[PDB]
Design a protein around this nucleic acid. Structure first.
Ligand SMILES: [Mg+2]
Ligand SMILES: [Mg+2]
Ligand SMILES: [Zn+2]
Lengths: 196, 134, 190, 52
RNA sequence: GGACGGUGGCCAUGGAAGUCGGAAUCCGCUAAGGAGUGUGUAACAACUCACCUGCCGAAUCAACUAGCCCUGAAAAUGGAU
């Protein structure tokens, strides 16, 4: 089973790289299976995306390189959680749509947040039975029209710090836009060419 | 959102139930339907199907309309009271039909063995209606 | 089975030097000097070069139990290097439900008094090991900082503090009060 | 009252542990065999029961 | 890190939504995912596993088997290779 799986995978990779001459190597950050399905549906119309084992990738593009030259210069660059998107379209048309269809990922517990966000002073809009998280975090909230109101601006998160469980559940219930990330292009490959 | 929304699903069907059903337990979430709401929801939800009938409702602030997603087992148990290939071929036309698909045959392959509750020889060697739907 | 040779090499940074007197290792760095003998283990210690200061630990014809000691010696020497270069700092937090735990640091950080652990009138006097200094952190409200050069001495002092505040005759899964080692790190962060 | 991170720190030493079924020894949470001779280093271990 | 869509799969129902139970084990995305090995939530939810992937760059894992040793192994006057 495993050997047949790997052999079929090798055949798929070699036929795909022979069929499609233009491919962008793209890094995968902390992305979900729902995002994978969404990207698959949104991209399967015009191009294809490939995201598997890096050892498989290097072995396929190295051992069977004899069919076409000008390929070994990808080898010292394919590292990390990366894959290949194969397209017959052009760089701008792929890049703008792939940079636009970024799902707003939430604040998962245990995830680093290089970006910075800050909650403003606005009504929560939820019932006044969730003051426990605010009081545990140290947030001054008072009753107003049967809703919870943030009377003062407070520092929520800084850059490059761990997110606690209380902060994560607060950002989950707040229904706001937290720091988000997705599938980001590392570099390109158009018939033997490396750019941004 | 009109100060209240009815996104929540239900898992009741067949018998009317009403008081025996958990609809009064959902009730305090919105306070709008109550008994005069769940009775009139069940009035249109008596059939399609006659089973548990997981379905969504939409509120017009006075009355509720009900839409039943085309669940495979739900619709096949509604159909049931043999191959019957054509009814399962046509039952998937009006569904969401996403199923992480890549071809039309995936949906019928899914439902052929969703009917296994043998409908597996077709799954093994099927050679009909691959591009029938598109 | 007797393995012919089991060796392991520890690199020594440039700012710290190591002198061998038989199986006694003397590690002198910017923060002090740590001296420790390994005469209870029959290994061979050698300093290799005048350039990068490798220290090799060799065991000849050792069975499994005494092959286990080579990496133990190497890790001890690495801890000595770490202590004399960056030092060891253990941060402890005092957690309590009702009675705050009052900690008073007596002369030069060598004595720790715990006053109101679980509201009892007993006073816990815990004496730190020599070379270990305790202090009350200025960044956190309930935090002790134990700093020293010897990791075993610092951690033993932290264990003494932790074991002094032990809840007895109660459900310890409910009475979580006490002083616990929150983190272990270095001084100077270099 | 104890805030959750300090509660987790206390529970790391007080609750998150293994218990030998034969000799009731308190073992580290990743233990597979008991460390004590009187039970014969048995591998009959259970989690320490929670207050929940 | 992902551990999905149909599907909060069917018959059990007062919630059992993958895990109080009875049957069967589908398909596709593929890097994988059990229409579920466990924790648990009234129930949702939130976790974990088997399954794959990333970093890591050389060997590793499992089930048995039998030698010595240990546990099993408690008695009365102080004592017997
Ligand atoms: Mg008691
Ligand atoms: Mg014996
Ligand atoms: Zn034991």
């Amino acid at each position: 089973d495993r050997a047949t799986w790997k052999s079929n995978y090798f055949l798929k990779i070699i036929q795909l790289l022979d069929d499609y001459p233009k491919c962008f190597i793209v890094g995968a950050d902390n992305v979900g299976s729902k995002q994978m399905q969404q990207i698959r549906m949104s991209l399967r119309g015009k191009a294809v995306v490939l995201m598997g084992k890096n050892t498989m990738m290097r072995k396929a593009i190295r051992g069977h390189l004899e069919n076409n030259p000008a390929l070994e210069k990808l080898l010292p660059h394919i590292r990390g959680n990366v894959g290949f998107v194969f397209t017959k379209e052009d760089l701008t048309e792929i890049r703008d749509m792939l940079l636009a269809n970024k799902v707003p990922a939430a604040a998962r517990a245990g995830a680093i947040a290089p970006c910075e966000v800050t909650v403003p002073a606005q009504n929560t809009g939820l019932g006044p039975e969730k003051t426990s998280f605010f009081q545990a975090l140290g947030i001054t909230t008072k009753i107003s029209r049967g809703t919870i109101e943030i009377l003062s601006d407070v520092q929520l998160i800084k850059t490059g710090d761990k997110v606690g469980a209380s902060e994560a559940t607060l950002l989950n219930m707040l229904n706001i836009s937290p720091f988000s990330f997705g599938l980001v292009i590392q570099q390109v490959f158009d018939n033997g060419s490396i750019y941004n | 959102p009109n100060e209240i929304k009815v996104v929540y699903l239900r898992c009741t069907g067949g018998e009317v139930g009403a008081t025996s059903a958990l609809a009064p337990k959902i009730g305090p979430l919105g306070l709008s339907p109550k008994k005069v709401g769940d009775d009139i929801a069940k009035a249109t939800g008596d059939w399609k199907g006659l089973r548990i009938t997981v379905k969504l409702t939409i509120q017009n602030r006075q009355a509720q309309i009900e839409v039943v997603p085309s669940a495979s087992a739900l619709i096949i148990k509604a159909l049931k009271e043999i191959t019957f290939d054509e009814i399962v071929n046509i039952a998937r036309q009006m569904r969401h039909r996403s199923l992480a698909r890549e071809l039309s045959g995936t949906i019928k392959e899914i439902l052929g063995t969703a009917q296994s509750v043998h409908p597996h020889d077709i799954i093994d060697d099927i050679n009909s209606g691959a591009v029938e739907c598109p | 089975m007797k393995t012919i040779l089991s060796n392991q090499t520890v690199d020594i940074p440039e700012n710290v030097d190591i002198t061998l007197k038989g199986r006694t290792v003397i590690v002198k760095g910017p923060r002090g000097t740590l001296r420790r003998d390994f005469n209870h283990i029959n290994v061979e210690l050698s300093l290799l070069g005048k350039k990068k200061k490798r220290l090799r630990v060799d065991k000849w014809w050792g069975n499994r139990k005494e092959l286990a000691t080579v990496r133990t010696i190497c890790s001890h020497v690495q801890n000595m290097i770490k202590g004399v270069t960056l030092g060891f700092r253990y941060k402890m937090r005092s957690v309590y439900a009702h009675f705050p735990i009052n900690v008073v640091i007596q002369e030069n950080g060598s004595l720790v008094e715990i006053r109101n652990f679980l509201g009892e009138k007993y006073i816990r006097r815990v004496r730190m090991r020599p070379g270990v200094a305790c202090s009350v952190s200025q960044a956190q409200k309930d935090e002790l900082i134990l700093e020293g050069n010897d990791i075993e001495l610092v951690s033993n002092s932290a264990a003494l503090i932790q074991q002094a505040t032990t809840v007895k005759n109660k459900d310890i899964r409910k009475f979580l009060d006490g002083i616990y080692v929150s983190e272990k790190g270095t001084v100077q962060q270099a | 009252i104890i805030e959750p991170s300090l509660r987790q720190l206390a529970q790391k030493y007080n609750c998150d542990k293994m218990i030998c079924r034969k000799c009731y020894a308190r073992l580290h949470p990743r233990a597979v065999n008991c460390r004590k001779k009187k039970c014969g280093h048995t591998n009959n271990l259970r989690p320490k029961k929670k207050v929940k």
